[PDB]
Design a protein around this nucleic acid. Structure first.
Ligand SMILES: [Mg+2]
Ligand SMILES: [Mg+2]
Ligand SMILES: [Mg+2]
Ligand SMILES: [Mg+2]
Ligand SMILES: [Mg+2]
Ligand SMILES: [Mg+2]
Ligand SMILES: [Mg+2]
Ligand SMILES: [Mg+2]
Ligand SMILES: [Mg+2]
Ligand SMILES: [Mg+2]
Ligand SMILES: [Mg+2]
Ligand SMILES: [Mg+2]
Lengths: 191, 171, 136, 197, 233
RNA sequence: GCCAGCAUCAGUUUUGGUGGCAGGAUAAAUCCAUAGGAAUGUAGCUUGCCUCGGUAAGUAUUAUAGCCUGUG
RNA sequence: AGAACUGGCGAUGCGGGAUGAACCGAACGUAGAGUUAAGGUGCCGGAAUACACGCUCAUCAGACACCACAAAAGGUGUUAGUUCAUCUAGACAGCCGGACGGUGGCCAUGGAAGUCGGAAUCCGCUAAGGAGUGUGUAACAACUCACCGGCCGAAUGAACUA
RNA sequence: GCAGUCAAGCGUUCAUAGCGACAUUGCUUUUUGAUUCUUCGAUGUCGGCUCUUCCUAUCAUACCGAAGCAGAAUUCGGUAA
RNA sequence: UUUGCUCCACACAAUAUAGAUGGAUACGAAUAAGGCGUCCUUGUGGCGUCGCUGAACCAUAGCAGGCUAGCAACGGUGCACUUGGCGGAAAGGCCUUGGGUGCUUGCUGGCGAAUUGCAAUGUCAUUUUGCGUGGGGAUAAAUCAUUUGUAUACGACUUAGA
């Protein structure tokens, strides 16, 4: 129908600042600083007061209107990351061969080394992305914690750590081995 | 074309045992009087047993708009022939004149349903007097209090085949 | 420590926006928006410039950065009274856009003898300008 | 009106530019096109790459050295469109094509000259916002051109030098404007203003 | 075809009730106020059908309406210039919850002292606080979950471990034949905000630490045309 | 003898400027007068309000803006 | 493989359909000027990168009669309509609570309690709740759905047409 | 292919004038894996040697998906010349 | 090889030539954004202004631009010399120093022009030499023939010898 005006609304909390010049967003908060390059959407941002941003599309179709809410969700995830953080927890299970997972520094680059997955002689190497921190949670057996400000980087690093050790040419109703995400939450889990 | 509106009043031929036959009037949207009288005889032959050589045209007049500068909302009832069958439709057009609304409807039917002039009947044109009697959302979204919108990405045509600075689409 | 969002400023088509007509019978003259018909078409009226009340495409005009208070759908005597009360012709004449328009048509109306005079005075001004430069 | 017209090819559409350059050449005007790696084609990168592969598939089957020749530079892709739009088998078309020069980047002596644009071939004026487009340097690199980093390094060097030149000329323009505005409100300035200058 | 969400497939026996049920409830409320002289506005918030089919059995003499709240307020005509009695707008604006209307005729202190008694036990009180702190031990978990005797219980079924872990965030394995969580994990504690997860865990471990008791807002006599307020919490 | 230029005309044709009339609802409009009305509700007044009068919702047919319809 | 009427080619150039006996326009002494037919006006190529309202994005789009062939059907691609419904007595989506009692209805079964099967399909209390829509257990449990209620506050759902 | 029961569209709004997609049963037993020594073959202007390309409608090799797929070995699909 | 060569100058004869006739007049990036000016802590900053086309900007008066006399300024500009830098993508060009010397329409005066006859491009910028005259300087190789065999149908290839 080509609606005349469509708007979404972003509520920004107290201790954080946002700076948007030409569809390039910078969020500065109590945990760091995140940035994003939104120069493929054709939207307009407007500051109402110092606590509300409003994003709008004028004379947009259906495919164009469907991107306002994804812009709002991306900027809200930036705000949520810089004020709470993202914490993913991964648990790894085995039947016979215990998996040894360690953090290494191969020419100063912070890899995860996985070895003895299903008795393999192969060493699997997965690089830590920039900004995500990996810890090994004591008092829980066979668990890893990934923490960061960027939900995209934290989730992508947990995803390729999941995908590096998959079962090949076997029966997956019988061979229950590998690493799985068990919880996605926040570093500051409340308040 | 650019249409006009005519009233056409016709009649049978007076004869023995039928003196003073009944007069019938129609409102035809057409671009000239020849097409106006042809459309009159088309509709009268479909509705009665009268031919063009059985009857005669009594009067042909052109109707102008009463208030040509006043933006009105029109509801138009039409029927048309598609490739499979024939259907009735209701549409809404916001414009200043009945002939203007009829022109926009003919363009809209050609653009949206590939219906030519020869397969469209205008059943009725009427003005919707009150708001909250407007069914179409594409018309309703212009009846809002204090309506404002911009025009982003202004494109200007030029001459001279060459420019000496990069253009700017600001507005 | 305040947030900063700049990103835009736009001229709006709305009731009361005055408008320069770029092509047609009434080219070069000002009118006002009195009603919005659709996304592409509006109803305009300018009584003082001498343009009739009519519907047009927005592609035949250009919006100016001038506006005044006007109710929706106001008739011609009303738009005349509000136009002269809000005094938009003087602000339009004080704009730098209209001065460039008048400068263009004044340069077009010149004769051969006035072109010769323009050349002589340009040389006389260039002398003192170039002498006042480089010894500042 | 100029003896040679130099066109900056950044941000133009390929066929809409080639049409107007072909007409200018046949009418008798000398054209130099620079920055041919920055041109655009409407449509997705994958679709344009598949079109180039359909072109790449055609060759003379009994001797591949006789066939259509597939040139990989962006300047040569532009030249192929232009040669399609003139009648190059005649002497008139040959002379028209010899009135033209196409380069990647801005080599000497054209880096000290003025570059123009063609507004009816510009992508921001012609394409609807939201449509996808392809960049010619990326398309030619994917099909086999091998000088995309050399040209980028040379273009960075040229941009540094022209930024110095512009800083100098902008300061000079500032002092000339200040010297001109102090000779206004003079009698000959008022006479010139009345005559319209 | 346009991209739209299609509804889920269910082919069952019940059908959806309409405005006729609301109209019948409104007519019943007006006729019940006309027939019974002791209309009491009560607030039965969190209650199981078993407990109500008991109070409806104890006061087997009066009438109880438990319809929609806005429909009941419309039947009592909560408009300031509308009524079916004299000045029932106070008793109409009193309703602010999952309201109930107990229309009686018998008493006016007995029907306000027995209620102060009926107060049986209930589930884990998902909105309020809980008292009995429970911590499951570091062994195989069982059905009563440290609320029965040693060998007088059944070990927990294998088909609930995925709900125990991926829907209550309790660390668990299987590792021999049963649930058998490795450490001892305390679910709830005394005098704290019991969460939805804690309340669902206490319900699945089948504990009953909160009490249900009726709360009567007001009671209006139609003979004197007057409503007395109460706070029988 | 060869090749041209200008003026005044005739025949054919193409492209501008301007004047006088006729018709139609003896254009329909705008504009002026007058009766009725409404809301995408102006003044006024009243309110959980009240950033110290900003806004919000309720009355009110022109008032400290206007509009619509009929008749002339 | 054969007939009927008319128009053509053969016997015929010219403008157009890129190209062609038969299609469209038009039939021909040698020239000049003007106007057109059919067909066209980004460039090849003479002539508007005219004006106006819409639709369409194709990982073999589509682009002009003869003539260089493809529907019903399927699409969670988009556009416009038609007929039914629901909705401030609060509709659709989401969160949360209820989801009861004769009764573990009757046969079959080593055991099957709504959920391996055959029969069946009732009654009460209800605001509503199936002699059960699925997951589940050896069988029970537990969860979900059908159906009602609280919170939030504006239009929403189905089938069909092109 | 023949015969019968259906039943969404239908006979451009009729169900049963008259169609009728998706289904569904019947009919074709040396009817309890039995007999059948059978290649019940087709082919008359082509066949063979030598040699080169192209198609994909994929046999093998590469990578994936499903299956009561324990392992091993297979089967059915997708991309791919 | 009857004075052959290099580099720089013209007496004279010429060559027009896909087509001179005031000037090809240098940021980069974005377009749902920028340019310019100003202010301060120096920013994704505050304030102001501009755009809606180069229809601009610079240049432009004098016999195709002559001969002279003054005023006012310390400017503009041509022409060779000169001091330095910079430029490698195809640099082959750009900036600058300091003196000579010409012009100046910034302003004011004095002479001259005709007959090309009422128009006829009415010839005005740019080039490579040639006949030897004019000034310094520079003194070579290749092929055939003879020979080799890392090569070979023949040519070609690869070696040796004043
Ligand atoms: Mg004449
Ligand atoms: Mg008149
Ligand atoms: Mg013959
Ligand atoms: Mg013939
Ligand atoms: Mg013929
Ligand atoms: Mg022909
Ligand atoms: Mg053809
Ligand atoms: Mg002729
Ligand atoms: Mg042309
Ligand atoms: Mg395949
Ligand atoms: Mg296997
Ligand atoms: Mg191969």
């Amino acid at each position: 129908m080509k609606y005349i005006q469509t708007e979404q609304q972003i509520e920004v909390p107290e201790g954080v600042t946002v700076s948007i010049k030409s569809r390039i967003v910078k969020v500065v908060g109590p945990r760091g600083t995140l940035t994003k390059n939104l120069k493929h959407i054709d939207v307009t941002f407007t500051k109402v007061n110092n606590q509300l941003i409003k994003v709008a599309v004028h004379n947009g179709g259906r495919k164009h209107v469907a991107a306002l809410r994804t812009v709002k969700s991306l900027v809200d995830n930036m705000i949520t990351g810089v004020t709470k953080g993202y914490k993913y927890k991964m648990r790894y299970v085995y039947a016979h061969f215990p998996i040894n997972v360690n953090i290494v520094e191969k020419d100063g680059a912070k890899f995860i080394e996985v070895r003895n997955f299903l008795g393999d002689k192969k060493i699997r190497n997965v690089p830590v992305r920039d900004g995500v921190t990996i810890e090994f949670s004591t008092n829980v057996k066979d668990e890893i914690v990934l923490s960061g400000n960027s939900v995209e980087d934290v989730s992508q690093n947990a995803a390729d750590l999941q995908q590096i050790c998959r079962v090949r040419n076997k029966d997956i109703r019988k061979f229950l081995d590998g690493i799985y995400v068990s919880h996605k939450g926040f570093i500051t889990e409340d308040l | 074309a650019h249409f006009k509106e005519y009233q056409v009043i016709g009649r049978r031929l007076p004869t023995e045992s039928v003196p003073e036959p009944k007069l019938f009037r129609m409102r035809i949207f057409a671009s000239n009087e020849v097409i106006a009288k042809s459309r009159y005889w088309y509709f009268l032959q479909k509705l009665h047993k009268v031919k063009k050589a059985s009857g005669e045209i009594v009067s042909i007049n052109q109707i102008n708009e009463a208030h040509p500068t006043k933006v009105k909302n029109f509801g138009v009832w039409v029927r048309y022939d598609s490739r499979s069958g024939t259907h009735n439709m209701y549409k809404e057009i916001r414009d200043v004149s009945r002939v203007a609304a009829v022109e926009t409807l003919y363009q809209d039917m050609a653009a949206r349903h590939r219906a030519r002039f020869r397969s469209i009947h205008i059943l009725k044109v009427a003005e919707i007097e009150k708001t909250a009697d407007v069914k179409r959302q594409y018309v309703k979204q212009f009846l809002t209090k204090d309506l404002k919108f911009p025009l982003p990405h202004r494109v200007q045509k030029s001459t001279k085949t060459f420019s000496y600075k990069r253009p700017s689409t600001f507005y | 420590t305040d947030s900063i969002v700049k990103a835009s400023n736009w001229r709006l088509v709305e009731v009361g926006r005055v408008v320069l007509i770029k092509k047609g019978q009434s080219a070069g003259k000002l009118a006002a928006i009195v009603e919005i018909i659709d996304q592409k078409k509006v109803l305009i009226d300018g009584p003082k410039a001498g343009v009739p009340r009519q519907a047009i495409n927005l592609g035949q005009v250009v919006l100016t950065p001038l506006t005044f208070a006007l109710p929706r759908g106001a008739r011609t005597a009303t738009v005349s009274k509000k136009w002269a009360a809000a005094a938009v012709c003087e602000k339009w004449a004080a704009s730098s856009w209209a001065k460039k328009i008048a400068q263009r048509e004044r340069r077009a109306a010149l004769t051969d003898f006035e072109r010769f005079q323009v050349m002589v005075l340009r040389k006389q001004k260039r002398y003192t300008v170039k002498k006042a430069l480089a010894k500042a | 009106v100029e003896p040679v017209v130099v066109i900056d090819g950044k941000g133009h559409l390929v066929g809409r530019l080639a049409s107007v350059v072909a007409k200018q050449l046949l009418n008798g005007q000398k054209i130099v096109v620079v920055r041919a790696e920055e041109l655009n084609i409407s449509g997705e990168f994958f679709r344009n790459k598949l079109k180039y592969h359909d072109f790449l598939r055609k060759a003379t089957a009994f001797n591949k050295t006789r066939g259509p020749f597939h040139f990989r530079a962006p300047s040569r892709i532009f030249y192929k469109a232009l040669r399609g739009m003139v009648s190059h088998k005649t002497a008139r078309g040959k002379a028209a094509l010899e009135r033209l020069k196409v380069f990647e980047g801005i080599p000497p002596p054209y880096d000290k000259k003025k570059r123009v644009v063609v507004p009816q071939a510009l992508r921001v004026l012609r394409l609807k916002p939201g449509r996808k487009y392809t960049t010619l340097g990326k398309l030619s690199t994917s099909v086999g051109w091998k000088y995309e980093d050399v040209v980028a390094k040379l273009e960075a060097k040229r941009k540094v030098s022209s930024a110095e030149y512009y800083a100098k000329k902008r300061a000079f323009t500032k002092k000339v404007a200040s010297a001109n505005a102090t000779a206004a409100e003079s009698d000959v300035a008022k006479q010139l203003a009345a005559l319209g200058y | 075809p346009r991209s739209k969400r299609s509804k889920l497939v269910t082919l069952a026996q019940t059908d959806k009730k309409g405005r006729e049920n609301k109209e019948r409830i409104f007519d019943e409320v007006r006729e019940a106020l006309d027939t019974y002289r002791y209309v009491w506005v009560l607030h039965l918030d969190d209650v199981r059908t078993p407990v109500l089919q008991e109070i409806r059995t104890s006061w087997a003499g009066s009438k109880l309406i438990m319809g929609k709240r806005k429909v009941l307020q419309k039947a009592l005509g909560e408009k300031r210039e509308e009524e079916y009695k004299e000045n029932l707008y106070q008793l109409s604006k009193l309703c602010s919850g999952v309201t109930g209307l107990l229309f009686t005729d018998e008493d006016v202190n007995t029907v306000k002292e027995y209620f102060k008694s009926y107060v049986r036990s209930d589930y884990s009180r998902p909105n309020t606080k809980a008292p009995l702190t429970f911590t499951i031990p570091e062994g195989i978990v069982y059905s009563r979950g440290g609320q029965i005797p040693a060998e007088e219980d059944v070990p927990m079924i294998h088909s609930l471990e995925p709900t125990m872990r991926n829907k209550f965030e309790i660390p668990t394995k299987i590792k021999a034949g049963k649930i058998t969580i490795d450490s001892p994990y305390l679910v709830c504690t005394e005098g704290e905000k019991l969460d939805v997860r804690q309340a669902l865990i206490l319900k699945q471990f089948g504990i009953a630490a909160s009490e249900f008791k009726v709360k009567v807002s007001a009671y209006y006599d139609n003979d004197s045309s007057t409503v007395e307020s109460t706070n029988i919490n």
